[PDB]
Symmetry: C2
Subunit: 56 residues, 2 copies
């Protein structure tokens, strides 16, 4: 259910969450799933993807 921040994190974009070590966080269930850093073998581009959009 609930996690705790091991480290400070400063947001790098408009969608990530800043937090300081020790905060208590709850994971939100979204349709998109976990996000992974991926490389497209098709296009050569790279960045984060919604795991629920892909399959092995």
């Amino acid at each position: 259910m609930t996690f705790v921040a091991l480290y400070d994190y400063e947001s790098r974009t408009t969608t990530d969450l800043s937090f300081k070590k020790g905060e208590r966080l709850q994971i939100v269930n979204n349709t998109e799933g976990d996000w992974w850093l991926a490389h497209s073998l098709t296009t050569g581009r790279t960045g984060y993807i919604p795991s629920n959009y892909v399959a092995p």
Copy 2:
């Protein structure tokens, strides 16, 4: 190792990857881990966090 895009996805920020259905993608191993949408019970803010930054 390798996944395939089930759906089109259009990037919403500077760090996500756009792709069209059918592309082949490889997951990149990063230090940050998976990213989760989280809600901070401490601050009330919400957004994506690097899973490796937190523990239960």
